[PDB]
Amino acid sequence: AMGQRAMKFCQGVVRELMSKKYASFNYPFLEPVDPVALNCPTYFDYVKEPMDLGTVSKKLSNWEYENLDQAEHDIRLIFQNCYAFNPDGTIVNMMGHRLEDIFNTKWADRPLYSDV
């Protein structure tokens, strides 16, 4: 039962991370990974909870997050999944760190209280 202030804040963070301003490095994180189409057929030997920014935005809009900590964890999972499958130094790994850098900056503005 997340409240309006927390909801608006979260949607704002997700909207920021998906915005075209970051298109040159956020495009791997906008939609669900498709292992076969991306020629990474072993993706789900490394990842067991897929998450992407579009999915966080849908769960948000469907009132599926109880509170801000829960939302933060789904967003953070996008990047843990990235590093679980893409080694250091690869392009997608580095894109993930750059987008996470922005997430870290934006998330520190969160309301102290996750209203209900």
Author numbering: 301 to 416
Question: Which sentences did the original study use to describe this structure?
Answer:
One attractive target is the fungal BET protein Bdf1, a global transcriptional regulator. We show that Bdf1 is essential in C. glabrata, and that inactivation of both Bdf1 BDs induces lethality.
We used a peptide array comprising histone sequences with diverse post‐translational modifications to probe the ligand selectivity of C. glabrata Bdf1 (CgBdf1) BD1 and BD2 (CgBD1 and CgBD2). Substituting a conserved tyrosine implicated in acetyllysine recognition by a phenylalanine (“Y/F” mutations Y166F and Y343F) abolished the interaction with acetylated peptides on the array and in pull‐down assays, demonstrating binding specificity. Crystal structures of CgBD1 and CgBD2 confirmed the expected BD fold (comprising helices Z, A, B and C), allowed comparison with human BET and C. albicans Bdf1 (CaBdf1) BD structures, and revealed details of the ligand binding pockets defined by the ZA and BC loops, including six structurally conserved water molecules.
